[PDB]
Amino acid sequence: AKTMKKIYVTMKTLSPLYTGEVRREDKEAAQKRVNFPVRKTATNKVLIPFKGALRSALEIMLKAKGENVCDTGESRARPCGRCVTCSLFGSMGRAGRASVDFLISNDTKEQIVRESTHLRIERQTKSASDTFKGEEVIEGATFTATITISNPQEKDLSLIQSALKFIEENGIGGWLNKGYGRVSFEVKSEDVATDRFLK
Amino acid sequence: VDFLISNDTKEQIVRESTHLRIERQTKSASDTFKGEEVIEGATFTATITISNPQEKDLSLIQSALKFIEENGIGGWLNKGYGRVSFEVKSEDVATDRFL
Amino acid sequence: KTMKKIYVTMKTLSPLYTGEVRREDKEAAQKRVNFPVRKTATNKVLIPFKGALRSALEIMLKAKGENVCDTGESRARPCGRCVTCSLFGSMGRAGRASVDFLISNDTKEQIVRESTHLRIERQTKSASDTFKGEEVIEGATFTATITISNPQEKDLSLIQSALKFIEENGIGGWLNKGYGRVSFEVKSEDVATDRFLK
Amino acid sequence: MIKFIAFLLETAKILIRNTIELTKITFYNNSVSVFIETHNGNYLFSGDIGYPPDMPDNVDYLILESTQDELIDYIERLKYTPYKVFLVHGEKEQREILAKRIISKKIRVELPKVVLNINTNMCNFASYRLMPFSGFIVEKDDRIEINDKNWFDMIWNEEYNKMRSQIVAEDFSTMALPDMSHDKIIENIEYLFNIKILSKNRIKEFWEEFCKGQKAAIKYITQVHRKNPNTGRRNWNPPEGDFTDNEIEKLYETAYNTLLSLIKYDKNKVYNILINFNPKL
Amino acid sequence: MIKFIGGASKVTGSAFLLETGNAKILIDCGIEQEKGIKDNNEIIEKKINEIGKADICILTHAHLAASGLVPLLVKKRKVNKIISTPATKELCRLLFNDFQRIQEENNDPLYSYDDIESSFEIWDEIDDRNTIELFDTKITFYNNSHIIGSVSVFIETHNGNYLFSGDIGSKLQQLMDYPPDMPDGNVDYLILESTYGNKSSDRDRLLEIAKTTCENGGKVLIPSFAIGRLQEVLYTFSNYNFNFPVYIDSPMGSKVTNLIKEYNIYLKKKLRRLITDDLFNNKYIAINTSNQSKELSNSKEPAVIISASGMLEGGRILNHLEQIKNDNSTLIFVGYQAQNTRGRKILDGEKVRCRIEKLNSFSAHADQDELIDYIERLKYTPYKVFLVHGEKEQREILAKRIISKKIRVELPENYEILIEKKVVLNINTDNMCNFASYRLMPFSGFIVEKDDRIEINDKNWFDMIWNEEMALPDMSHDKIIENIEYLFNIKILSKNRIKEFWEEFCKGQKAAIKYITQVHRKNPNTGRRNWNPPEGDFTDNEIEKLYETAYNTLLSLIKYDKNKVYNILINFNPKL
Amino acid sequence: KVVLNINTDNMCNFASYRLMPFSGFIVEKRIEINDKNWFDMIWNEEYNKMRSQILPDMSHDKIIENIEYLFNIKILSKNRIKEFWEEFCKGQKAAIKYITQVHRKNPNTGRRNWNPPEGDFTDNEIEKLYETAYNTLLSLIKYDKNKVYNILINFNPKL
Amino acid sequence: DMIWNEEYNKMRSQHDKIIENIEYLFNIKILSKNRIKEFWEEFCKGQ
RNA sequence: GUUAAAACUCUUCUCAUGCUGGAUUCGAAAUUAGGUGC
RNA sequence: CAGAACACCUAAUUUCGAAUCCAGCAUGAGAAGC
Ligand SMILES: [Zn+2]
Ligand SMILES: [Zn+2]
Ligand SMILES: [Zn+2]
């Protein structure tokens, strides 16, 4: 109501980072050169989705704790509107209090995105069957995001921080199984006034 | 308050996309759906004309614009969509300038 | 629920060469070295661990004789119904075991050296070709974890069997020349998925 | 920016030794010329020439006229030689003959919506540099851009896709579907309407594809019910409830059978069926 | 729009930030030195942080005065791409490594070696006359005769055509072309750097003194710089026969001199033809390690020591100059000697016992009349000449003469027309239709790129106009296709070979000539070419004819235009 | 008068009215109605004039049967059918070049760029399935745009 | 678009207490002037 | 010179919410720091 | 007019850089003042 939580999230990259290009035209433009383009902006910056990773993290950990959280990851599954993640990230009735931005990079592709080569070793002759080139984000690349909770309760800090620690465990996006996407987060949280901008 | 009219057309700023829904346990794409978006760096114009102006219409309109910058404009505001930046050129006008 | 931490430690016992994959890192090192080592932008050496583990498990389990597909032939589609498909992934489910990369604990200066190799003419016994590469020195320590999301009973012993295959056969490139012989130390722990939830 | 007609000058919108300050305007004698100063320019409308005139103090632009030696004498003796001269108010061939001599003193001439090139080759044929090109002139609402047949190819293919996916073979035009009584249709569509497999969007889309003929409705219900070979996923909304996996399939089969059995009912009859569920249409 | 970031005396930061509408263009990200002072680096970093994220860093030449802050501009991650000439790129490889080496000996660091290799990853290279289209700007290089790889930058923006001169070379330059190459087209703004010295080929005098001293019983020590200057005095010893020997005791100076002789295609046209004949002949004897350096310093039979530490401050010129300072010999100061340097104290007597002669012919930058002549060659008179670097004094006298030529000057401490490179349509506009809610019209015609105006003119205009109106080998197009197919089938020409040759051809024609000459160069110590050996039963005469066929086939393909080369090479290598 | 220059196959039946979705060019020549082919030929004719001044046949039912079979073994996926629609729509020389590109056995690796078959088949027959795929997708280029779209939207709707 | 519409349409061819309560609901705007007009229109139409 | 003439169907209300381009695939395959000199 | 620190010879070359799945659902269609 009168107050609102601002969570400035600074993410550093440790392993290589991949998030696939979602725009059709940008992707098909890049498939003349690279087979797995990094999700990039038109201002030449790296765009990573961040709301769904936080929601998936909090869903898995709250489900393992034993809380009454619906699973919105199942195919066309309706959120019930009474879970904690429904109050934070959203339900069908009401939107989420937390409005997570994309992880906008602090640099610009040509300093952080490199074109890499991955293969498929044939297991008995030890030769390369397939060879594919994919773009990735270097390690130490800095990404910025802000999580703006409109109506803060007390848990909305610690739940977001716990989900961020889960994203340090499993990775933020792309090929999480091959070791990509391992990142760290720093959190600067403040509770601003909603009427701050009114002079 | 005029509509936010872009200066570009669709092939320059509108891109189709691929948005997903991932199963939490299997880590596989349960759902796929396509959705158009306007690109970053795209710029738009709107002219707000205030008849009978008071002193504080400027301050309230700029304050609303910083709130729109903080929240976003349009849809999918929770996923990070619609975060923008505003520039304002204000001008006082005598209403009879067409005469 | 539970998830399994497998903290994996590699000590290099014979010079380790894995190849640089980044094009900008590789065609700017071509004036110096003809075979760069895979490095980070933090200048630590990266090794791809997953494919070595999965190749190991296909080779050993196919030799023992169970239904395990091959993910190594040309455009080989995984089946979804095997132990390797459950652990490391398929075209349906993802891999239950997330295998992090092998990043060295020391930066490039301590562990990467710039070596000279040769091709000797078999008749004249003289140097016929000469090329420079980069190798990770012996005793360099690389750290990974392996996380298993849905842990089954056999999974630690399966990963450690693949880690014994990689100790004997090797990891990386130039494998038949003696490059890449390693030793693994593994500390395992089972952790609950609600651990960061205070 | 000068617009030729006399001589208009758009900065103040004036159109052509004391100093009158409107845009610093100052009239020097021709033996009369006017020197105008603005932040974007130091223009000089000379008028005609007669022999020792009064050239201004930097004349960024010098808009002169002649119909020959005196023009060039005045082109010199002016400190800080102009960026571009303009050759007006004369015959074209004599203007070009003078202009060759202003090029020989290394000073540029010009003889009297924004348009964007989205082109990409060059040729050095004749005195001027060029690139032969056949293309398209689009006239967008604030730009006029130039394109080639690749862009016309892309919008032609978009028009072809948008016009092919717009008219089906036998829709709104004039058998072997299942059959089931009206009471079981009531019970099934009530049951499949409380849980969300038959929802108001799906009843409405059944209504449009039934109004477009029976075969359009059969095609729609088949492609809704068609299980994918790969994902094993049908285009129904999932039922809200415990239903484990097999009565999921029997329930989608119930939706398939109930809609397909409702197809051969009369159009007014399926209307009196559906409006209890979706009040709109 | 142009900003001169520290463009007064290039100490503690110098850059030219062209602020065009789409790009943050940077020219000459460089640093000078004051030869001794620590907080300097903090003023450098403050300037560097103030620059902002520069979209393209362009290096006119390879001196640290022009390229000294480049890996610092990669450490702060402000640079996007680093474009230069290839000889400039390898020269700053050696110069950045040496810069950091001195910082380590100075006990320092402004940047690090990771910043150096991270600079050379994003480092694109183009040679002279190669217009590349980046971010509303068409950028071309043109030679300015300064040092190897030195160019002047020509940036055509829609708001104007700028020509950053860099350093213009003198008339005493023998290794390079004397006429500094220029844009054929317009120059709205020319960013000129003034002189440092004064207006006279002593040249021969060097060979005079070194004659008289070597016959007198004394070796001649010639201190010199390691960029150009050592190769200038070695080329004057290469031209005229000097009977006593020469010796380079400079490791960096020698590998720069080698870097001259693989990049001989970027030097003067009269020396581009230097055939398996070296340009410096085999007259130069190079000292490799410190032990030949010590033995040569101890050795006393007269001989030129022609080496590069610079100004008697540190290096192997030192180890020679200690015993020579204890000596019949002489020191020949063919370079300027800066303030606070030990060799300036040797050049001002504050006392080297052996003879002091400086020579003023061997100067790197040009003269005042040469900057005038540089100005007058221009096709059009410039609108404004921004004199930026030099001493303040001669900037004033050159400024006075260039005001006398009645073109305008902006000094940096004393620092507004708009030039829209307009595009205009000269075709009928009324006959247009609608297909996909677009007001379109098919038209066929001719775009004519005239200075200061791109016009789109009909067939009628071309009717009016037309009615009014290296030493590469040559072979036919079908012979090119046959020979590349035959060498591809026998595996001499490969897909990596065709890819690399395509990269050097998009680099520019002379870089590709260098690439094919470097591959086809038989090493005389071994006998090996870098060509891929063929598959089959070819004997040595046939293997040599096939290597020469590959040489003469990738030459005379270079002579064709870009589209023709791509259309030939895209069949054999489908990926570029 | 007005002359249509289009064969009126692919005419649907909207209610009691036969109907064709079509794109073309009004030519004030005989007021001709000309297709896109016309425009491509006349564009290239004016390109050559401007610059100057300075398939095997298969039956339709066999095409459906073979594309059916190659769809079931996933040699011809919908990614392939979609990109073949792009390269046929762009033109015919592009479709020839694309199909030769995916069918070219690389001399260094021995690999075709098709998708491998699902199921057990001998390597000779897997190769014959590849050659069959070359023959049908090349034979498809001889037809017009309308029958190519109508053939391949039964397999990739959206193509 | 015409024919599509016209074929569609073609297929689309086939006592004091109440005073006190209405005086209450007129003030809190639950029943309104449009509501009175349409409820009276339904009553004038019939029952 | 028309039962003329005069009177804007106006105001208020963001297509918003829910859904991570995810999954499969090891830069490795070839090449003795060799030739010289107690 | 700026960097400068027992011996040779070498330090190149060649392949691949693709293939596949999915692109669906669901809600809301009213008020009120003049
Ligand atoms: Zn919920
Ligand atoms: Zn399997
Ligand atoms: Zn210089």
CSV table of C-alpha atoms in Angstrom, one decimal, chain D residues 15-224:
chain,number,residue,atom,x,y,z
D,15,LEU,CA,13.6,35.7,-47.0
D,16,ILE,CA,16.1,37.6,-49.1
D,17,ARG,CA,27.7,48.8,-42.3
D,18,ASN,CA,25.5,49.4,-39.2
D,19,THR,CA,24.1,46.3,-37.7
D,20,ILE,CA,20.4,45.7,-37.3
D,21,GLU,CA,19.8,42.8,-34.9
D,22,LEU,CA,16.6,40.9,-35.6
D,23,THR,CA,19.7,36.6,-36.8
D,24,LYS,CA,22.3,39.4,-37.2
D,25,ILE,CA,21.4,41.1,-40.5
D,26,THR,CA,23.8,43.6,-42.0
D,27,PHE,CA,23.7,45.2,-45.5
D,28,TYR,CA,27.1,45.8,-47.2
D,29,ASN,CA,27.3,47.8,-50.4
D,30,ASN,CA,27.7,46.0,-53.8
D,31,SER,CA,29.0,49.0,-55.9
D,32,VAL,CA,23.2,45.9,-52.1
D,33,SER,CA,24.4,42.6,-50.5
D,34,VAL,CA,23.2,41.3,-47.2
D,35,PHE,CA,25.1,39.2,-44.7
D,36,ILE,CA,22.9,37.3,-42.3
D,37,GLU,CA,24.2,35.5,-39.2
D,38,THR,CA,22.5,32.7,-37.4
D,39,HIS,CA,23.8,29.9,-35.2
D,40,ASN,CA,23.6,27.5,-38.1
D,41,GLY,CA,25.1,29.7,-40.7
D,42,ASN,CA,26.7,32.9,-42.0
D,43,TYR,CA,24.9,33.3,-45.3
D,44,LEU,CA,25.7,36.0,-48.0
D,45,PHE,CA,23.2,37.1,-50.7
D,46,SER,CA,25.5,39.2,-52.8
D,47,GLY,CA,23.2,40.5,-55.5
D,48,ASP,CA,24.9,41.4,-58.7
D,49,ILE,CA,28.5,42.7,-59.1
D,50,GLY,CA,29.6,45.9,-60.8
D,51,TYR,CA,34.7,46.7,-59.2
D,52,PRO,CA,36.1,47.3,-55.6
D,53,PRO,CA,33.1,46.1,-53.5
D,54,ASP,CA,32.7,45.7,-49.7
D,55,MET,CA,33.1,42.0,-48.8
D,56,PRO,CA,32.0,41.2,-45.3
D,57,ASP,CA,34.4,40.7,-42.4
D,58,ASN,CA,33.5,34.3,-42.2
D,59,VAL,CA,31.0,33.9,-45.0
D,60,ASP,CA,30.0,30.2,-44.5
D,61,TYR,CA,27.6,30.3,-47.5
D,62,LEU,CA,28.0,32.6,-50.4
D,63,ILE,CA,25.0,32.8,-52.7
D,64,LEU,CA,26.2,34.7,-55.7
D,65,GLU,CA,25.3,35.2,-59.4
D,66,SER,CA,27.1,35.9,-62.6
D,67,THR,CA,26.5,35.6,-66.4
D,68,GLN,CA,33.0,36.1,-65.2
D,69,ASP,CA,36.4,37.3,-63.9
D,70,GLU,CA,34.7,39.6,-61.4
D,71,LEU,CA,32.7,36.7,-59.9
D,72,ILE,CA,36.0,35.0,-59.1
D,73,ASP,CA,37.7,38.1,-57.8
D,74,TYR,CA,34.8,38.3,-55.4
D,75,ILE,CA,35.2,34.6,-54.7
D,76,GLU,CA,38.7,35.5,-53.4
D,77,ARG,CA,39.5,38.5,-51.2
D,78,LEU,CA,37.0,37.1,-48.7
D,79,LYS,CA,38.6,35.9,-45.5
D,80,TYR,CA,37.8,32.3,-44.5
D,81,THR,CA,36.6,31.0,-48.0
D,82,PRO,CA,33.1,29.7,-48.0
D,83,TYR,CA,32.0,26.1,-47.5
D,84,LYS,CA,29.5,26.0,-50.3
D,85,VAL,CA,28.8,28.6,-53.0
D,86,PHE,CA,25.5,28.7,-54.8
D,87,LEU,CA,25.3,29.7,-58.5
D,88,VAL,CA,21.9,31.3,-59.2
D,89,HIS,CA,20.1,33.7,-61.5
D,90,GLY,CA,21.9,32.9,-64.8
D,91,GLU,CA,22.0,30.7,-67.8
D,92,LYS,CA,22.8,27.1,-67.1
D,93,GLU,CA,25.8,26.6,-69.4
D,94,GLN,CA,27.5,29.8,-68.2
D,95,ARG,CA,26.8,28.7,-64.6
D,96,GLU,CA,28.5,25.4,-65.3
D,97,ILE,CA,31.4,27.2,-67.0
D,98,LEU,CA,31.9,29.4,-64.0
D,99,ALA,CA,31.3,26.4,-61.7
D,100,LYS,CA,34.2,24.4,-63.2
D,101,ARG,CA,36.4,27.3,-62.1
D,102,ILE,CA,35.0,27.4,-58.6
D,103,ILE,CA,35.8,23.6,-58.5
D,104,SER,CA,39.3,24.5,-59.7
D,105,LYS,CA,39.7,26.8,-56.6
D,106,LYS,CA,38.6,23.7,-54.5
D,107,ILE,CA,35.3,25.2,-53.4
D,108,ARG,CA,32.1,23.2,-53.5
D,109,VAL,CA,29.1,24.4,-55.6
D,110,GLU,CA,25.5,23.4,-56.0
D,111,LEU,CA,23.5,24.4,-59.1
D,112,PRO,CA,19.7,24.8,-58.5
D,113,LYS,CA,9.4,13.0,-45.6
D,114,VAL,CA,13.0,12.0,-45.3
D,115,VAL,CA,14.0,9.2,-47.8
D,116,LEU,CA,16.0,6.3,-46.5
D,117,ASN,CA,18.1,3.8,-48.5
D,118,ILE,CA,17.8,0.3,-47.2
D,119,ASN,CA,20.0,-0.9,-50.1
D,120,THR,CA,23.5,-2.4,-50.3
D,121,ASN,CA,28.3,-3.0,-55.3
D,122,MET,CA,29.5,0.1,-57.1
D,123,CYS,CA,30.5,1.3,-60.6
D,124,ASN,CA,32.8,4.1,-61.7
D,125,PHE,CA,31.2,4.7,-65.1
D,126,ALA,CA,31.4,8.3,-66.4
D,127,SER,CA,32.1,11.4,-64.3
D,128,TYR,CA,29.8,10.2,-61.4
D,129,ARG,CA,29.8,7.2,-59.1
D,130,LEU,CA,27.0,4.7,-59.2
D,131,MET,CA,25.3,1.4,-58.6
D,132,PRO,CA,22.5,0.1,-60.9
D,133,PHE,CA,19.5,-1.0,-59.0
D,134,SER,CA,15.8,-1.9,-59.6
D,135,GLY,CA,13.6,-1.5,-56.5
D,136,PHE,CA,10.6,-0.3,-54.5
D,137,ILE,CA,9.6,3.0,-53.0
D,138,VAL,CA,7.6,2.6,-49.8
D,139,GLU,CA,5.9,5.8,-48.5
D,140,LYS,CA,5.4,5.2,-44.8
D,141,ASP,CA,3.7,7.9,-42.8
D,142,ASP,CA,6.9,9.8,-41.9
D,143,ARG,CA,9.6,8.1,-44.1
D,144,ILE,CA,10.0,7.1,-47.8
D,145,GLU,CA,12.3,4.1,-48.0
D,146,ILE,CA,13.9,2.2,-50.8
D,147,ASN,CA,13.9,-1.6,-51.0
D,148,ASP,CA,14.6,-4.4,-53.4
D,149,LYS,CA,12.7,-7.6,-54.4
D,150,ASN,CA,13.8,-9.5,-51.3
D,151,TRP,CA,11.6,-7.3,-49.2
D,152,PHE,CA,8.7,-7.6,-51.7
D,153,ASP,CA,9.3,-11.4,-51.6
D,154,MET,CA,8.9,-11.3,-47.8
D,155,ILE,CA,5.7,-9.3,-47.8
D,156,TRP,CA,4.4,-11.3,-50.7
D,157,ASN,CA,5.0,-14.6,-48.8
D,158,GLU,CA,3.4,-13.1,-45.7
D,159,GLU,CA,0.3,-12.1,-47.8
D,160,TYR,CA,0.2,-15.6,-49.3
D,161,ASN,CA,0.3,-17.3,-45.9
D,162,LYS,CA,-2.3,-14.8,-44.5
D,163,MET,CA,-4.6,-15.4,-47.4
D,164,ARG,CA,-4.2,-19.2,-47.6
D,165,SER,CA,-4.9,-19.5,-43.8
D,166,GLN,CA,-8.2,-17.6,-44.2
D,167,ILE,CA,-10.6,-19.7,-46.4
D,168,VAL,CA,-11.2,-23.4,-45.8
D,169,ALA,CA,-12.5,-25.8,-48.4
D,170,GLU,CA,-16.2,-26.4,-47.5
D,171,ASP,CA,-17.0,-23.9,-44.8
D,172,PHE,CA,-20.5,-22.3,-44.6
D,173,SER,CA,-21.4,-24.9,-47.2
D,174,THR,CA,-23.9,-27.8,-47.7
D,175,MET,CA,-23.4,-39.2,-41.9
D,176,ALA,CA,-21.2,-41.4,-39.8
D,177,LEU,CA,-20.7,-39.5,-36.6
D,178,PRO,CA,-21.5,-41.1,-33.3
D,179,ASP,CA,-25.1,-41.0,-31.9
D,180,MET,CA,-26.3,-40.5,-28.3
D,181,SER,CA,-29.5,-39.2,-26.8
D,182,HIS,CA,-30.1,-35.7,-25.6
D,183,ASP,CA,-30.2,-36.6,-21.9
D,184,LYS,CA,-26.7,-38.1,-22.0
D,185,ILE,CA,-25.6,-35.0,-23.9
D,186,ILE,CA,-27.0,-32.9,-21.1
D,187,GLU,CA,-25.2,-35.0,-18.4
D,188,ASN,CA,-21.9,-35.2,-20.3
D,189,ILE,CA,-21.7,-31.5,-21.1
D,190,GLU,CA,-22.7,-30.4,-17.6
D,191,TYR,CA,-20.0,-32.8,-16.2
D,192,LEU,CA,-17.4,-31.6,-18.7
D,193,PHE,CA,-18.4,-28.0,-18.1
D,194,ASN,CA,-17.9,-28.0,-14.3
D,195,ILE,CA,-14.4,-29.4,-14.6
D,196,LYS,CA,-12.7,-27.5,-17.4
D,197,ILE,CA,-12.5,-29.5,-20.5
D,198,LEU,CA,-15.5,-28.0,-22.2
D,199,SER,CA,-15.1,-24.3,-21.4
D,200,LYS,CA,-16.9,-21.3,-22.8
D,201,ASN,CA,-14.2,-20.6,-25.4
D,202,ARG,CA,-14.4,-24.2,-26.6
D,203,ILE,CA,-18.2,-24.1,-26.8
D,204,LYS,CA,-18.0,-20.9,-28.7
D,205,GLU,CA,-15.4,-22.3,-31.1
D,206,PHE,CA,-17.6,-25.4,-31.6
D,207,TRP,CA,-20.4,-22.9,-32.4
D,208,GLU,CA,-18.5,-21.1,-35.1
D,209,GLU,CA,-17.1,-24.3,-36.6
D,210,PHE,CA,-20.6,-25.9,-36.5
D,211,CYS,CA,-22.1,-22.8,-38.3
D,212,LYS,CA,-19.4,-23.3,-40.9
D,213,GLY,CA,-20.8,-26.8,-41.7
D,214,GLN,CA,-20.6,-30.2,-40.2
D,215,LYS,CA,-17.3,-31.1,-41.7
D,216,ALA,CA,-15.6,-27.9,-40.3
D,217,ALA,CA,-16.9,-29.0,-36.8
D,218,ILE,CA,-15.6,-32.6,-37.4
D,219,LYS,CA,-12.2,-31.2,-38.4
D,220,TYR,CA,-12.1,-28.8,-35.4
D,221,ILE,CA,-13.1,-31.6,-32.9
D,222,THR,CA,-10.6,-34.0,-34.4
D,223,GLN,CA,-7.7,-31.5,-34.3
D,224,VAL,CA,-8.7,-30.6,-30.7
